[PDB]
Structure 1
Amino acid sequence: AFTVTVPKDLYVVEYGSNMTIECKFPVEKQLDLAALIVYWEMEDKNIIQFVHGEEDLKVQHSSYRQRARLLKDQLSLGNAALQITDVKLQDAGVYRCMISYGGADYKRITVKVNAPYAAALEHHH
């Protein structure tokens, strides 16, 4: 039974810092990159799409361009690691990772963002 698991389903990240959130999927024997699909989204905004060889920036929401990378070396180990760079308050919420590799599954991760008064103030209006 193909099951994606998450070591953490909650992350607490500092405003402006970098973030790595992980989804584990089973990789027995060598990895077949052609049969792997990884989809990373947050509340209906597409962050990352990995079909066949490389990502696809066709659906990547503008709030994530140049800011989101999928750690490719980690796929061989069974790790779909999403990195977001320079975390902002609008990065708090529910992330979903969909993984297709033989079987198909997905998991949910919650990111809370702590921010100082100045940043919160700019985000308030």
Structure 2
Amino acid sequence: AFTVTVPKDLYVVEYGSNMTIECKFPVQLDLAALIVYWEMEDKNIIQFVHGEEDLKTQHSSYRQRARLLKDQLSLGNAALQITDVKLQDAGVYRCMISYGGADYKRITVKVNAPYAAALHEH
């Protein structure tokens, strides 16, 4: 059965940093058979369908900050890079991968920030 794995399911990062969170899936890669869908608490981050990124329902809090590392896909690695991490990025992410089957995993992200930074986003 198709299984998605997460070697690391807890990330603790500082606000303003860049972070790359990863889900592994078994793989030469056939982009025509692949869907990668990253989401966090009902906010869509990445929809990648047959080699094309669809931003149509990406949540505005992630606009211009979220990237799927496409070169990693050929390694069986769905790697989501978030730049300039916000307080609002803390939470549980789900990677939903379809590739001859479908599975998902949950990744917890914590963001540390001083009071003034958390107040910026309050």
Distance, in Å, in 2 between the alignment partners of 1:70 and 1:34 is 16
Distance, in Å, in 1 between the alignment partners of 2:30 and 2:19 is 27
| Unmatched 5+ stretches in structure 1 | none
Distance, in Å, in 1 between the alignment partners of 2:64 and 2:112 is 22
Identity %: 98
SS of residue in 2 equivalent to 1:111: strand
| Unmatched 5+ stretches in structure 2 | none
- Structure 1 runs of 4+ off > 3 angstroms? none
TM-score (norm 1): 0.94
Number of residue-to-residue matches in the alignment: 122
| Deviations 1:59-100, CA, capped at 9 Å, x for gaps | 100111110000000000000000001001010001000000
Please report how far the alpha carbon of residue 124 of structure 1 lies from its aligned counterpart in structure 2 after TM superposition.
7.1
Distance, in Å, in 1 between the alignment partners of 2:73 and 2:92 is 22
Say what the alpha-carbon RMSD is for the aligned residues.
1.1
Aligned to 1:102: 100
Please report how far the alpha carbon of residue 47 of structure 1 lies from its aligned counterpart in structure 2 after TM superposition.
0.2
Distance, in Å, in 1 between the alignment partners of 2:19 and 2:121 is 23
| Equivalent residues of 2:87, 2:111 under 8 A apart | yes
SS of residue in 1 equivalent to 2:32: helix
| Equivalent residues of 2:87, 2:121 under 8 A apart | no
